Amino acid sequence: WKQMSWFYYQYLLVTALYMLEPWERTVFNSMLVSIVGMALYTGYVF
Amino acid sequence: APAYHLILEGILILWIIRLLFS
Amino acid sequence: LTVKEKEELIEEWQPEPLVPPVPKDHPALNYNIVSGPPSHKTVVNGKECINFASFNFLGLLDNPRVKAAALASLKKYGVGTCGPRGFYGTFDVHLDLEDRLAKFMKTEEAIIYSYGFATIASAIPAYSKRGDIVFVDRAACFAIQKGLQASRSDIKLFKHNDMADLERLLKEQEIEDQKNPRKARVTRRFIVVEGLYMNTGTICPLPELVKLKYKYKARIFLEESLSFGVLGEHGRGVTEHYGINIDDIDLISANMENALASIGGFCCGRSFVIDHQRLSGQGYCFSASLPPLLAAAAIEALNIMEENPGIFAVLKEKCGQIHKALQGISGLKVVGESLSPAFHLQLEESTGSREQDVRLLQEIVDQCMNRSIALTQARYLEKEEKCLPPPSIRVVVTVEQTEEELERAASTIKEVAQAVL
Amino acid sequence: IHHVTQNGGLYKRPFNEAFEETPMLVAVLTYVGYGVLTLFGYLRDFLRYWRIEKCHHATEREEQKDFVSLYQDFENFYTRNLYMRIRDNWNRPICSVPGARVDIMERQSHDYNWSFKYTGNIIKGVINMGSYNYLGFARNTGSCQEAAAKVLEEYGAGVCSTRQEIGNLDKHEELEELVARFLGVEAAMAYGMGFATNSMNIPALVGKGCLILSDELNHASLVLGARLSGATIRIFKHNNMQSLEKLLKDAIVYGQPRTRRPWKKILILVEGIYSMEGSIVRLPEVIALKKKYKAYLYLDEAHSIGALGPTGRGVVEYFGLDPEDVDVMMGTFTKSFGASGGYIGGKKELIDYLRTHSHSAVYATSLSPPVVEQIITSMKCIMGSLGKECVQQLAENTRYFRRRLKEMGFIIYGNEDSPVVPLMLYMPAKIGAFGREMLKRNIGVVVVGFPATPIIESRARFCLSAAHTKEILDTALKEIDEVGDLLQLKYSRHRLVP
Amino acid sequence: MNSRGIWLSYVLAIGLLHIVLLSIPFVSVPVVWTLTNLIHNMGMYIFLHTVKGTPFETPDQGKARLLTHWEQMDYGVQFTASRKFLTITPIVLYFLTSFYTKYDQIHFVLNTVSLMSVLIPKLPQLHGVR
Numbered sequence A: 001w002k003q004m005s006w007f008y009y010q011y012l013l014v015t016a017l018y019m020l021e022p023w024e025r026t027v028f029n030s031m032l033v034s035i036v037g038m039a040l041y042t043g044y045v046f
Numbered sequence B: 001a002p003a004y005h006l007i008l009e010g011i012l013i014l015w016i017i018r019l020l021f022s
Numbered sequence C: 001l002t003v004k005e006k007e008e009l010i011e012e013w014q015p016e017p018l019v020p021p022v023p024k025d026h027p028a029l030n031y032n033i034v035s036g037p038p039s040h041k042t043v044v045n046g047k048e049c050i051n052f053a054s055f056n057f058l059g060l061l062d063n064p065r066v067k068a069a070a071l072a073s074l075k076k077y078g079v080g081t082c083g084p085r086g087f088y089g090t091f092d093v094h095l096d097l098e099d100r101l102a103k104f105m106k107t108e109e110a111i112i113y114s115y116g117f118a119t120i121a122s123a124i125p126a127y128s129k130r131g132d133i134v135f136v137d138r139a140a141c142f143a144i145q146k147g148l149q150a151s152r153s154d155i156k157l158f159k160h161n162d163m164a165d166l167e168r169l170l171k172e173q174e175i176e177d178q179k180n181p182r183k184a185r186v187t188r189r190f191i192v193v194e195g196l197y198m199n200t201g202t203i204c205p206l207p208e209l210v211k212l213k214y215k216y217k218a219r220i221f222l223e224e225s226l227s228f229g230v231l232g233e234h235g236r237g238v239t240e241h242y243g244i245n246i247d248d249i250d251l252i253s254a255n256m257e258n259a260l261a262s263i264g265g266f267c268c269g270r271s272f273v274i275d276h277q278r279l280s281g282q283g284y285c286f287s288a289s290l291p292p293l294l295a296a297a298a299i300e301a302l303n304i305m306e307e308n309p310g311i312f313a314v315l316k317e318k319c320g321q322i323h324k325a326l327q328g329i330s331g332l333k334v335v336g337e338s339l340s341p342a343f344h345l346q347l348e349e350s351t352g353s354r355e356q357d358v359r360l361l362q363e364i365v366d367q368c369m370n371r372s373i374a375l376t377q378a379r380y381l382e383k384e385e386k387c388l389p390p391p392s393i394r395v396v397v398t399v400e401q402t403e404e405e406l407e408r409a410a411s412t413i414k415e416v417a418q419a420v421l
Numbered sequence D: 001i002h003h004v005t006q007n008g009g010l011y012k013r014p015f016n017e018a019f020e021e022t023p024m025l026v027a028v029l030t031y032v033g034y035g036v037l038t039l040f041g042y043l044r045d046f047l048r049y050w051r052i053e054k055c056h057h058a059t060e061r062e063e064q065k066d067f068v069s070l071y072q073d074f075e076n077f078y079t080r081n082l083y084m085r086i087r088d089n090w091n092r093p094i095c096s097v098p099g100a101r102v103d104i105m106e107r108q109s110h111d112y113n114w115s116f117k118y119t120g121n122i123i124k125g126v127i128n129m130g131s132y133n134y135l136g137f138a139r140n141t142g143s144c145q146e147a148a149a150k151v152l153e154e155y156g157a158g159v160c161s162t163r164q165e166i167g168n169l170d171k172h173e174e175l176e177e178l179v180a181r182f183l184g185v186e187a188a189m190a191y192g193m194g195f196a197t198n199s200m201n202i203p204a205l206v207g208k209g210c211l212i213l214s215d216e217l218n219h220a221s222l223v224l225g226a227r228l229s230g231a232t233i234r235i236f237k238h239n240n241m242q243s244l245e246k247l248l249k250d251a252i253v254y255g256q257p258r259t260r261r262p263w264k265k266i267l268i269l270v271e272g273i274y275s276m277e278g279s280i281v282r283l284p285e286v287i288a289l290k291k292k293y294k295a296y297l298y299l300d301e302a303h304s305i306g307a308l309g310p311t312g313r314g315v316v317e318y319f320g321l322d323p324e325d326v327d328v329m330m331g332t333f334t335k336s337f338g339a340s341g342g343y344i345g346g347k348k349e350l351i352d353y354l355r356t357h358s359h360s361a362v363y364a365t366s367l368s369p370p371v372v373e374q375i376i377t378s379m380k381c382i383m384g385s386l387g388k389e390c391v392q393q394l395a396e397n398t399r400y401f402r403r404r405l406k407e408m409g410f411i412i413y414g415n416e417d418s419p420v421v422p423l424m425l426y427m428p429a430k431i432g433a434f435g436r437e438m439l440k441r442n443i444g445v446v447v448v449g450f451p452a453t454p455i456i457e458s459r460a461r462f463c464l465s466a467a468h469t470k471e472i473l474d475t476a477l478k479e480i481d482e483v484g485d486l487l488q489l490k491y492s493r494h495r496l497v498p
Numbered sequence E: 001m002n003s004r005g006i007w008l009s010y011v012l013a014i015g016l017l018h019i020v021l022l023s024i025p026f027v028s029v030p031v032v033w034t035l036t037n038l039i040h041n042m043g044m045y046i047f048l049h050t051v052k053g054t055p056f057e058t059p060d061q062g063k064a065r066l067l068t069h070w071e072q073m074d075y076g077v078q079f080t081a082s083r084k085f086l087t088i089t090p091i092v093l094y095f096l097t098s099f100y101t102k103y104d105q106i107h108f109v110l111n112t113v114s115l116m117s118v119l120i121p122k123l124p125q126l127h128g129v130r
């Protein structure tokens, strides 16, 4: 699917990321990959 | 199987109900 | 408990009426009707007369240059705006006048309001909040008193024109400051003062009030609605009069209605403080902007004041001789300095009351309309007032008079002052 | 006859006002959005104890400034952190007359909206829907506006005096007799700013020892004039008669707070066609309820003086009531007449009191000649030639625009016949995005939020007009449908299929 | 407030603070229940009892900047519909950190202390002292 350009646009709107500066909008984006990274870490035990 | 707080843990249920009706 | 038979029985309640019956005797009730434009030779009630009570100190009202530049902006904009300036209501004549006023006053920025009474009623309470203290002149105009009342805070009035009383009152705040150092760090102090008061008619002492601000850490809001375009070599306010830097006076706010002969008011200052009224200025955003034919008449009047900076010397000479030519009349006295334009004639040795005192001045005014001379008395609201001035007559001098018409003014008023008093 | 209630108020035509409820999925994602902005607000404000990261921005003098911080550090956490990010959507300058198509100056910032530059190009054609231009009296070449330049020559551009002392022209009496025959009252009085008809004549009327029965969401000037009066204010819920009647017979049995004495007088401040939620007041139910409890009514028709009714005179003519039944009437001449200022209206025993004790008549200068001669010749045009034709046009542009935009699937507040149409944008990022996408699509709209409305209720307003034609509207409805799918704004359970 | 919508976001905030603070296999222990109690009680005390003032500008001109968030909300009315909800839900979190704790008096001394520093400032007695 090439239409993935549109689904990323909605991620900027419903998380208020759209109006944030593009030098400090990765600080949010690099954090959430590690939160999910520490949640796929989380997944195995218990 | 309590240890020693089961009285105060009982009164917290009581304090919810005394807080609720107002 | 007040059962349902009681709560219906208590419906016999009847209120006061919405408005008390104003008496026939009431002075304000009759308004003068002016036919034609209220120029130099006006027509009041069908009497050709030379007025001394309109405020166009530089004329600029019947000026062919001003009325030509304002006609050329009705022909491309219509008359009215439609929106309140945050919503398609800035016509770009607005950008060109806020840019052009800041360069005249040599400051960094100016804002423009669309009404002269709300430029300072809405600029005081944007900065002053509940936990403050404001020191006022106590001879201030009504537009300041309505701005101080909206900015809920602590208001302390010092006596007229004295630094001694102003100082005395600041030293007590440093006493209450060190008795609660913790809460003295969160409260700001302001000093609200005017240049050339419209009541007393004098100038504040500004060079010794500015070296008094650097000691006690207050902030100055000057409000020069009368001395803008009157005092100074370039007409530049009261700070040119004394020779004081404008970077020491914080906010400054005039109105574009006396020396500019237009509608509305401005407020110029630094961009750190003038950039906070766009959103919190109560009268700025929740109101429609200024019609672009009034903002084109104010650029052109502001061009005329920069072509000849010698019109300010013929206003200082003009007002100097009529203040000398009214010193020896018997019954009523002159309040104000020689360099001030309004100089209202107060009444010496008051009869006894006010309603009687207003009645004496009503006959002096009404008798002079039959000669050639139009003048009015200062109007007030006696009940909603922090300090009520005495009754007086206002004598406003302009540039488009003459030595011969100025003397005829002083000799006529002396001839009827002793024939009534 | 059509519908009577228990409040005694009867309606002659049906009253169909609908207010949709938030979907509750969108309502969650509005708090996720607002918190992120706040979280980063601290981060951007974190670099303030080190003035190197950001410079050349508004700060204290620092040459003699060791005083108390003029703006509280916590304070103004909204102007410089949330407003400033999407700030290029409001203060847009204009190059032409504001009727239908309008020129816009193009500008551009490099600092992410901290300072601007004006490039030079101007968008030549731009359908505008953000100007109170009802009946479209905003034009540069018109018969009604041709008689305003004739009086601009000899008369001047502004009386340098006050109404009480040498500032009362003969133009000002021939206006105040014409308004009183327009409305249907006995006297009238004109002011010069419509903001200061309210903040200067409410405190002259009520005083200390009286109660003011305000409405939940009134304009900021009715809020101001009730604060300067010293009267006690109580706020009844928006257009709720049950909440008024409770709050009004609870205030008669009891009295002034501590002393429990009776009040002196009670007045109620309402409006007609509220700007934010565009909705007509339930006016037969207030009048039938103030006769029961003997209160007074401060009606305020600013957005409906030329914009609603069978002939456009008032919200009074719309319901079919006699104007001699409301104590005071307010109005501004800025919306339907395209001129500055405002009137007030009532009996002769009240206007004689307001010519005498009002703050504007004694301290403030009056209306300028040219703008007073534009309201006179435009008010005469409504009484006729073609004055009852442009009113019928605005009544059928409202109905057509409103049903064709509700059948799409948007959430629209308001009444069926109210020419301000708010579209709902319940997200803080779509405020800055719905405004910027419509300029690409050659249309200018108005988008608001916290300064004017409730923080969680962001919307977009669509002030209609009679200078709009059918082909202009269908061009605009074609592009809202496209942006309505691009940002996903169609979210309402019901869908009025034709 | 939207009483369904503001509570639903607040409950999902606890569920999101729980699922991220879960099993984390360097610390593979069910004391992450206790950590969900530890972070949230300290979180509320900052945003409802420490931060004083309002985030806007000139709300009602001068308004009470010396009053905390708990005592400025709801116009100062005692037990309306939400003041109960904010003082009934953190005490229910005490019950869930004792069914998965199975009391052992070492994390107990961190759960009752963190509960009293939330429950005592919500009492309608002390109103403005700090």
Ligand SMILES: CCCCCCCCCCCCCCCC(=O)CSCCNC(=O)CCNC(=O)[C@H](O)C(C)(C)COP(=O)(O)OP(=O)(O)OC[C@H]1O[C@@H](n2cnc3c(N)ncnc32)[C@H](O)[C@@H]1OP(=O)(O)O
Residues within 6 Å of the ligand: C084, C086, C087, C285, C286, C287, D082, D083, D090, D214, D215, D216, D217, D218, D219, D220, D222, D223, D226, D227, D233, D235, D275, D276, D428, D431, D447, D448, D449, D450, D451, D452, D453, E059, E060, E061, E063
């Ligand atoms: C993401 C970026 C966003 C972008 C947005 C930028 C926008 C762009 C700019 C565009 C410009 C738009 C221009 C067109 C505008 C337009 O087309 C018409 S839009 C016009 C609508 N405007 C407003 O309504 C603004 C003011 N509104 C209020 O003020 C509300 O009422 C509050 C709920 C806030 C107060 O609530 P509160 O302040 O929290 O409660 P308080 O008690 O503290 O109130 C403080 C004191 O006021 C009294 N009072 C509160 N309510 C009152 C009421 N109802 N009626 C009478 N009095 C009221 C209280 O009794 C207090 O009196 P005092 O005891 O004497 O001090």
Ligand SMILES: Cc1ncc(COP(=O)(O)O)c(CN[C@@H](CO)C(=O)O)c1O
Residues within 6 Å of the ligand: C082, C083, C084, C285, C286, C287, C288, D132, D193, D194, D195, D198, D219, D221, D222, D271, D275, D300, D302, D303, D332, D333, D334, D335, D341, D342
């Ligand atoms: C009761 C009442 N009083 C005054 C005004 C505005 O006053 P103005 O004459 O300065 O626009 C409005 C609408 N205010 C509009 C003006 O277009 C606005 O956008 O702010 C109102 O509803």
